Amino acid sequence: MQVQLVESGGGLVQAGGSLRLSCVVSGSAVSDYAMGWYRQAPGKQRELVAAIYNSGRTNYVDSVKGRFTISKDNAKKTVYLQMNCLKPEDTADYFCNLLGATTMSNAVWGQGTQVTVSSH
Ligand SMILES: [Hg+2]
């Protein structure tokens, strides 16, 4: 199967501010697979920060608990990432994808959405 991903919602934001990223997915991937938001800081590799499962349950990395919130809408085929209490460590390109896309030979990452956090 082929999936297509389009992230949006990023931009320049002051420290402590907030942003909401959106992730529109093709086919039936949001409802069928577990979805996750990834970020790739300058120099680093993509890391999973938030994951949402078929039950609607969520799991986060320690650094983002209380600041990030992930949610999805199956009808809209969209995965959301509410980002609060932003820090310079949150400056990165943010991507969404299937929680298991390593199995798929079509390594399809999206263009992502850039997030930049300034200093008041
Ligand atoms: Hg916070």
Author numbering: 1 to 120
Task: Reproduce the article's own wording on this structure.
The VHH domain is structurally similar to the IgG VH domain, with three complementary-determining regions (CDRs) that are responsible for antigen binding. We describe the introduction of cysteine residues at conserved framework serine positions in a Nb specific for human complement component C5 and subsequent site-specific labelling with Hg derivatives and structure determination by SAD and SIRAS. Hg incorporation did not perturb the structure of the Nb or its antigen-binding capacity.
To investigate the potential of the Hg-derivatized Nbs for rapid and automated structure determination without prior phase information, we analysed two SAD data sets exhibiting space groups P212121 (Nb36-C85-1) and P21 (Nb36-C85-2). Owing to the low symmetry, 180° of spindle rotation was required to obtain a complete set of anomalous differences. Since only a minor difference between the anomalous signal in the two segments 1–180° and 180–360° was observed we did not pursue SIRAS phasing in this case, but instead performed SAD phasing based on all 360° of data. This resulted in a set of phases with an overall FOM of 0.34 based on 19 sites in eight groups. The Nb molecule that was placed manually appears to have a slight rotational freedom within the crystal packing, since the CDR pole of the Nb has very poor electron density, whereas the opposite end containing Cys85 has much better defined density. Two of the Hg atoms are each inserted between two side chains, as also observed in the P212121 crystal form. As for the P212121 Hg sites there is little or no density that may be readily attributed to a benzoic acid moiety of PCMB.
